[PDB]
Amino acid sequence: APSRNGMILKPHFHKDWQRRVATWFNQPARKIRRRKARQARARRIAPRPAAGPIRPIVRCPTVRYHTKVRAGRGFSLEELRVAGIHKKVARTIGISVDPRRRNKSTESLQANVQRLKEYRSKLVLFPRKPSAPKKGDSSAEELKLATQLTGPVMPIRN
Amino acid sequence: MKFNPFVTSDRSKNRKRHFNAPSHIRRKIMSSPLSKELRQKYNVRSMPIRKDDEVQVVRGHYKGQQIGKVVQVYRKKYVIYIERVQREKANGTTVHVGIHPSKVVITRLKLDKDRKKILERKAKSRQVGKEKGK
Amino acid sequence: VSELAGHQTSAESWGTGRAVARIPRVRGGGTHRSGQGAFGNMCRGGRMFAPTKTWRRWHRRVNTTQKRYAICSALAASALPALVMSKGHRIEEVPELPLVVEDKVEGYKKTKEAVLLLKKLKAWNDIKKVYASQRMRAGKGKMRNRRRIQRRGPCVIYNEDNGIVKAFRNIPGITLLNVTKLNILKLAPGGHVGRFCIWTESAFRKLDDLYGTWRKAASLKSNYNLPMHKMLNTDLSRILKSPEIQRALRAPRKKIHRR
RNA sequence: CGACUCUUAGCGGUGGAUCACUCGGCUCGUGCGUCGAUGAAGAACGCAGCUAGCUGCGAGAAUUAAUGUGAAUUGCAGGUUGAUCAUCGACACUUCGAACGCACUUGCGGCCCCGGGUUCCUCCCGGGGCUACGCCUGUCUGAGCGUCGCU
RNA sequence: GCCGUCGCUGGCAGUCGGCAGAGCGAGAAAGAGAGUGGCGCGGACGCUACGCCGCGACGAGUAGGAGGGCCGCUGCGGUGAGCCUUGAAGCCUAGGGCGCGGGCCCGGGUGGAGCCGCCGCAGGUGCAGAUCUUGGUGGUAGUAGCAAAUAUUCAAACGAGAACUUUGAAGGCCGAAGUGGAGAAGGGUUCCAUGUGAACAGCAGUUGAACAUGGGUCAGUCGGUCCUGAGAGAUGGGCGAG
RNA sequence: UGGAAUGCGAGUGCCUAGUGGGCCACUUUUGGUAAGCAGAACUGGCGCUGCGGGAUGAACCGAACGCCGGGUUAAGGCGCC
RNA sequence: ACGGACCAAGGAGUCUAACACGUGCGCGAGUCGGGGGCUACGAAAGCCGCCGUGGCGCAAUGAAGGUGAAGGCCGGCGGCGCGCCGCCGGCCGAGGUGGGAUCCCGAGGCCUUCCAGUCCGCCGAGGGCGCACCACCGGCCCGUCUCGCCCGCCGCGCCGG
RNA sequence: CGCGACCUCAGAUCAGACGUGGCGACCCGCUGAAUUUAAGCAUAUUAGUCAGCGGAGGAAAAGAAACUAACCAGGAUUCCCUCAGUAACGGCGAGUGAACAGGGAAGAGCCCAGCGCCGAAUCCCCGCCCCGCGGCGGGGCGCGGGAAAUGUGGCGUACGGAAGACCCACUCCCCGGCGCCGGGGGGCCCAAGUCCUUCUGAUCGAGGCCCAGCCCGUGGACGGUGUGAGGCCGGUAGCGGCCCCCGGCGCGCCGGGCCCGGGUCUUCCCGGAGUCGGGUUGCUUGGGAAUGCAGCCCAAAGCGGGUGGUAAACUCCAUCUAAGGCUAAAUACCGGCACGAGACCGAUAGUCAACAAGUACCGUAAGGGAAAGUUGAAAAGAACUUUGAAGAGAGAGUUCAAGAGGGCGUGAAACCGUUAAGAGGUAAACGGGUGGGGUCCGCGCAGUCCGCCCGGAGGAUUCAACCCGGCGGCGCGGUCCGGCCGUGCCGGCGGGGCGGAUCUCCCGCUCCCGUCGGCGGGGGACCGCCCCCCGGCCGGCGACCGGCCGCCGCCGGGCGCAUU
Ligand SMILES: [Mg+2]
Ligand SMILES: [Mg+2]
Ligand SMILES: [Mg+2]
Ligand SMILES: [Mg+2]
Ligand SMILES: [Mg+2]
Ligand SMILES: [Mg+2]
Ligand SMILES: [Mg+2]
Ligand SMILES: [Mg+2]
Ligand SMILES: [Mg+2]
Ligand SMILES: [Mg+2]
Ligand SMILES: [Mg+2]
Ligand SMILES: [Mg+2]
Ligand SMILES: [Mg+2]
Ligand SMILES: [Mg+2]
Ligand SMILES: [Mg+2]
Ligand SMILES: [Mg+2]
Ligand SMILES: [Mg+2]
Ligand SMILES: [Mg+2]
Ligand SMILES: [Mg+2]
Ligand SMILES: [Mg+2]
Ligand SMILES: [Mg+2]
Ligand SMILES: [Mg+2]
Ligand SMILES: [Mg+2]
Ligand SMILES: [Mg+2]
Ligand SMILES: [Mg+2]
Ligand SMILES: [Mg+2]
Ligand SMILES: [Mg+2]
Ligand SMILES: [Mg+2]
Ligand SMILES: [Mg+2]
Ligand SMILES: [Mg+2]
Ligand SMILES: [Mg+2]
Ligand SMILES: [Mg+2]
Ligand SMILES: [Mg+2]
Ligand SMILES: [Mg+2]
Ligand SMILES: [Mg+2]
Ligand SMILES: [Mg+2]
Ligand SMILES: [Mg+2]
Ligand SMILES: [Mg+2]
Ligand SMILES: [Mg+2]
Ligand SMILES: [Mg+2]
Ligand SMILES: [Mg+2]
Ligand SMILES: [Mg+2]
Ligand SMILES: [Mg+2]
Ligand SMILES: [Mg+2]
Ligand SMILES: [Mg+2]
Ligand SMILES: [Mg+2]
Ligand SMILES: [Mg+2]
Ligand SMILES: [Mg+2]
Ligand SMILES: [Mg+2]
Ligand SMILES: [Mg+2]
Ligand SMILES: [Mg+2]
Ligand SMILES: [Mg+2]
Ligand SMILES: [Mg+2]
Ligand SMILES: [Mg+2]
Ligand SMILES: [Mg+2]
Ligand SMILES: [Mg+2]
Ligand SMILES: [Mg+2]
Ligand SMILES: [Mg+2]
Ligand SMILES: [Mg+2]
Ligand SMILES: [Mg+2]
Ligand SMILES: [Mg+2]
Ligand SMILES: [Mg+2]
Ligand SMILES: [Mg+2]
Ligand SMILES: [Mg+2]
Ligand SMILES: [Mg+2]
Ligand SMILES: [Mg+2]
Ligand SMILES: [Mg+2]
Ligand SMILES: [Mg+2]
Ligand SMILES: [Mg+2]
Ligand SMILES: [Mg+2]
Ligand SMILES: [Mg+2]
Ligand SMILES: [Mg+2]
Ligand SMILES: [Mg+2]
Ligand SMILES: [Mg+2]
Ligand SMILES: [Mg+2]
Ligand SMILES: [Mg+2]
């Protein structure tokens, strides 16, 4: 029995909702648990970045969002072929790779190739054996100065 | 305050762990301080009492400067019985009045090998704490 | 209260006739609980009216600007002389009420040296008041791990922790606060404003970096200015007996005219 | 002033309300997240010097061994080269029960090996190990006017 | 005369004091206003301005609405250099009282260990009823009742105590399809001895199927065990999401 | 010369409980023999309301109500109760 | 008429979500970290702005394709019959009427011995700018209906304004 | 007919293994209602819900597009915010109701069949030797037995792959053992008063501990001890100590497997069938000319097939590779073990169960299912005398208290007994008003004080006024000197930190022939705001002062002498 004036309303409480009530009192404990797991991963991979491998400069679909730029799933195979990095070497040196992506635009292709060229210069590759370094390894002055990068590595700014 | 998240600061749980403790924890709880002379000599603050110890009663009705031998240590009622600390029943028999070991000081220790080992370990821990404080 | 409390018993109502009060009663049996009455808030045992739920709205959020206004008011009332004594602090022997101490207070690591610092600052009367007002809690809170109660003492705000927390936490009454992590619940205990605080030099200099003046914005925060005064000259007595207002007034009609 | 009845007060009985205590619940959060044919869950029956219930245990039966602890358990008696406690990693774990030799009466079997009986001569008694269904790999024995090769 | 409500959005910061001049109840729009030429150190209360004070009128109330509670219960953050084994809470009171009232404070007794005032916060927060739920207790009421199947009497013994126990004698009944002697199902120590009279045996009991200590069921032939009946129920097979 | 008398501070916007069974009375009046019957019009009461009177009394007459003292009436009465 | 021997204890508009209105606070054409991340009480608190993504509000309307919230005046030129339409340069540039609390101007006067006479206040005839708000008249945008005339070209059209 | 193979099917108490059942809070697959609402009810709704059934794990499931979109395109799965109570479904009624994208937590990719190359290059079991044997593994020796061509292993899987030729550059990846150096579980310990008086039955109560303001405190959480304890005890805090067990990060050695990559050119190859899809029916979905699943019938194709939220034909496009499989993480947990906390409950409350609780008891059974805490600090649980047969008492005794006496803390009301007082034929009881009698209270019973003055009797080392020192108030000192501040303003041959959608020598990248144009970053110049030095006004010190000076008041010490 509605009164004088008010909004029409459809409360979705006609089911037995009280059995399925997800209380959110686990929330600060889960914040502590995510924090401890993230610090555990950061202590596990000691020179590597705590965030992870780098993620591409990505245009958005669906015309509401295409002015904005995201961080994507991984680099394209044509991007890796132009930059000169093998797709199995890239996963080992800390580069996100996905085979599903295409390259229709040339400008975003050149931008991700340039970001690969910047990341190859910024990368400090440690040798496999410390006693016997190889040809493609970093210098001994860089071995001591190399450390973690807090936050996302090369944060994509619009 | 306490900062260990596993140490209980709950009244009912602490009373449960007290009144339902097994006998080796009953012995640890039922401990008594040593005298000033024995404390200066051994550098030991307190020890668990034994059946063959000497006691001056500090608090209660039977307190004084009377050094009495322990009759036996009754850990079920958390009590000890002392030789001259007793009273007369109605019929005439003497019943040892129970004294809790917290109101009990030791004038002479009964020293066996395990007793000397516990005293040396407590003196060693006291010396380590004193060296860490220095 | 658990949802199964009262509903574990199966109880069909006896109907009408039987000259019973039309209540769901326990289905038979050769025991005391047989035809007794299980469901309903008024029956012995069973359920109560309105079982308290886990999904009660326990938590209330406050706007960030209101939180910062509460912090600024709780800090600003800690400088006025009357508002600190109206909280209750014995401050008669304290040499200056904005008590700013040197940066050697973070260097202390001993409670004996902290007590000696409180003696030399002559704020020990508040801690002795806390010792005198350690008493027993009234009611059923004693069996709910709230046995001993005492008075809150002087707060101490530190910038860096170099043993100041270890030196000052064992003295009963003193709450320690960091400069960037000031709390409303500790700056204003019980909703009453003007708790006595003890600042260090770096903590007293860092407040202008935190909140700024009215012409300089917050350097550490993103966008926060000081709140605006509704009136500047809050002393209305000097406003009332001023030559500007008292010229353009009428005559006071103070003659009492009775019937 | 009588007896009986009504009201108030002191006291004494029926009764256990109120208050104060709480080795208990309820809620929330954390870590672990593990049963069983090498016999689970559960059930039955026994086990204490005096022992009904609870608790613990399995004919080694309120416990065995090992480690740590270091003079007791106790209601009453009895007796430091380790009593009592906790951990428990070794040993043991009656009968049903997925329950397993077929049935559930605690009944009836079958095979092999030991000791009384024998002097392997068959019974009888006692002890021990097997004997549930389905299915996987391999082995053995087989069946087929199924497909063939030789005489 | 007193209480409360409403209105005058009435009045009060003017307690302006040898740094002074003590007022704006008075029928009459507006100043106890500035200028320039012709001895004795003195004066009650006030004003938690969410307070104080003065005028007038008004005062019923169901359902219902709103406001004030320095009315009451429980817990929390503060606070009272709070109370307390030289006596806390609870309870009783022919005592002293206060408030319109909700209720509250002291005096006396009991009690033995916690409790309360103020500012806020929160609720499982106030009972006279619901043929309300639980527990307890009255009138009825020392009342209805201890009335189906013929019947008991005397003496002695144990014992503190005898209508009921035991023995003897007398008189009766069930009158061999029994009130007799034995079984099945079911009961499970009820069977037997010794002791008790706390509780039960709707009176009593020295008695009992009650209580507490102890004992008692001996099989090749008596049954089960074996067989099959009416039937039940595995294997193969079929069906079925299971 | 606020263009009759008299009286009174007015206008306006939200949110909104309860109610949606009524009854009685001077006058008018429908149906019915009539009804303490059923159904209407105006207004007032009861409902929601105590008080004095009608001995008694939900509606009649008077008169509406904070707690009291002095006086005075209404409606009714002044043999006794 | 129903419930009700008596007494003690328990006992009935609570909680969550959504919406409306009123009030208090903070910020303000902005507001909000609610989700995430960083630093005993503390599971609290503080912080993030290239974590304001996103919600709500600042723009509505149409079923949709879509569209989307003042104008006036002067000069010059072209067309048509001093008047109208179209195209370029400067100015005025955010509606009006009435009721409107408050504010502004001040014809005059507010007294101590008569006139002259400056400054501070104070009241007021009468005249104004007019807050909010109310009632109306106008104006603008959008969908729809009627009457007709012009403008533009990358594609001269069943085009667009 | 006999012998020997293969194929199908048997029998084994054959040798070696596995499954059965339980718990089930979370998870997966089925099956699956009616209450209720629509103010009736039948579609709907409750609701893929309750109940029923099967199956695991510590998580399960899902999962690396036969995807979303139509944009300058994103890119496995899972979970949160938002999309959004929206698109949509619905007697278009009641009601139901997603997905994309964006921000995050997490982030990890892959393997087969086919197609093909390699002497089956492959796998299991048994005999012997060496190591290790409580997760039965590694190597060697066997004309040992089988599996497998009706196809095991290596390369290889949609991101292309294989083979051949030509260039470039390395020779270190994994498994199983032995020893050595430097978080988890268990056990034992580590500070300070029982200090002097005073209460008490007992202190943990109260006072003090002076000049080291009793001692410790990285320990003033909690619990016990004869009420209330930082210092009596267990503990508490501590990058505190000691002794065992376990795993991991590394080093050194032994036995092995492996002879492994990338770019360019040439030649070949490439895909999952009663499956997709269509018709029909039933369930389901927001999915509406049918989203998904299932039953029947038809039944494919290879520049093919699926999707592109309105059925169909033509036409270009966009985007994936279905009909095979594996995979942690973020996610869920009212069951279990070990824990921690509480603005909760305080024995009719909180779980049914604080206690011999799923117990006693009831029902043939499935099932139903209670009530029940408190002596005291310590049993110190009442010796002994006496009446009674005893239950019961009376003395005596313990305890602070028996007015705490074995269902005993406190002991209310209803009800009952006794004593005291008052009363009694309109049932009792009540409201207003008095009267009388009792209980105690006013510790009443010659009755309250407070200022000024007069008069008579007394007593101080004292009044006013001066001297010195200190403190306080004010100062329009008309306008003293000096500091501080301003939610007030300026000036600068001043030095800086932020912000800006104000402009323009060095470094990096690609395109073109050391040069010329493009993009980004860093200086550099411009403006706004702020900080610090100055120089000058205004204003304040009455949320914010120093020194003298002048006045007043107060305090302390000197005097001053009794008509004060
Ligand atoms: Mg309504
Ligand atoms: Mg991330
Ligand atoms: Mg610790
Ligand atoms: Mg309950
Ligand atoms: Mg209380
Ligand atoms: Mg009680
Ligand atoms: Mg009870
Ligand atoms: Mg037994
Ligand atoms: Mg042993
Ligand atoms: Mg041992
Ligand atoms: Mg049989
Ligand atoms: Mg009136
Ligand atoms: Mg009223
Ligand atoms: Mg009474
Ligand atoms: Mg006590
Ligand atoms: Mg509550
Ligand atoms: Mg009641
Ligand atoms: Mg009689
Ligand atoms: Mg009779
Ligand atoms: Mg018979
Ligand atoms: Mg017989
Ligand atoms: Mg017998
Ligand atoms: Mg009887
Ligand atoms: Mg069958
Ligand atoms: Mg009605
Ligand atoms: Mg009606
Ligand atoms: Mg009528
Ligand atoms: Mg009325
Ligand atoms: Mg009336
Ligand atoms: Mg009459
Ligand atoms: Mg009349
Ligand atoms: Mg009168
Ligand atoms: Mg009369
Ligand atoms: Mg009736
Ligand atoms: Mg009725
Ligand atoms: Mg009745
Ligand atoms: Mg009650
Ligand atoms: Mg409404
Ligand atoms: Mg509002
Ligand atoms: Mg076998
Ligand atoms: Mg299973
Ligand atoms: Mg319905
Ligand atoms: Mg209905
Ligand atoms: Mg119906
Ligand atoms: Mg459904
Ligand atoms: Mg189910
Ligand atoms: Mg498992
Ligand atoms: Mg899985
Ligand atoms: Mg997606
Ligand atoms: Mg929305
Ligand atoms: Mg319709
Ligand atoms: Mg649905
Ligand atoms: Mg998305
Ligand atoms: Mg192959
Ligand atoms: Mg794929
Ligand atoms: Mg204590
Ligand atoms: Mg003391
Ligand atoms: Mg303590
Ligand atoms: Mg102390
Ligand atoms: Mg200690
Ligand atoms: Mg210690
Ligand atoms: Mg269905
Ligand atoms: Mg459906
Ligand atoms: Mg198409
Ligand atoms: Mg596939
Ligand atoms: Mg697949
Ligand atoms: Mg906590
Ligand atoms: Mg109880
Ligand atoms: Mg009880
Ligand atoms: Mg109780
Ligand atoms: Mg209960
Ligand atoms: Mg009791
Ligand atoms: Mg007592
Ligand atoms: Mg008592
Ligand atoms: Mg007590
Ligand atoms: Mg009692």
Numbering used by the authors:
A (entry chain L): 2 to 159
B (entry chain Y): 1 to 134
C (entry chain C): 54 to 312
Q: Can you quote the paper on this entry?
A:
We structurally characterized the paused ribosomal complex (XBP1u-RNC) by cryo-EM and single particle analysis using a mutant version of XBP1u (S255A, full length numbering), which was shown previously to pause ribosomes more efficiently than wildtype XBP1u. The average resolutions of the paused complexes were 3.0 Å for the post state and 3.1 Å for the rotated hybrid state, respectively, with the ribosomal core reaching a resolution of 2.5 Å. The majority of the visible XBP1u nascent chain adopts an extended conformation, except in the proximity of the PTC where the AP forms a prominent turn in the tunnel. The turn is comprised of eight residues from W249 to W256, and involves the C-terminal half of the characterized XBP1u AP. The turn in the XBP1u AP makes several key interactions with the tunnel wall and is in part in close proximity to the PTC. It is framed by two tryptophan residues (W249 and W256) and protrudes into a hydrophobic crevice in the tunnel, causing the displacement of the base G3904. The positively charged side chain of Arg251 in XBP1u forms a stabilizing salt bridge with the phosphate of A4388, whereas Gly250 and Gln253 engage in hydrogen bonds with A3908 and U4555, respectively. In contrast to some bacterial APs, we observed U4531 (U2585) in the XBP1u-stalled RNC in its canonical upward conformation. Therefore, the premature positioning of C4398 (C2452) in the closed conformation due to its interaction with Leu259 in an unusual conformation provides a mechanistic explanation for PTC inactivation by inhibition of A-site tRNA accommodation: Leu259 would simply clash with the incoming Asn261 tRNA.
XBP1u has two hydrophobic domains, HR1 and HR2, and a C-terminal AP of about 26 residues which pauses the translating ribosome when residing in the ribosomal exit tunnel. During this temporary pause in translation, HR2 is exposed outside the ribosome exit tunnel and can recruit the signal recognition particle (SRP). As a result, the paused XBP1u ribosome-nascent-chain mRNA complex (XBP1u-RNC) is targeted to the Sec61 protein-conducting channel on the ER membrane, where mRNA splicing by IRE1α is now possible. We show that the XBP1u AP makes extensive contacts with ribosomal tunnel components and forms a unique turn in close proximity to PTC in the ribosomal exit tunnel.
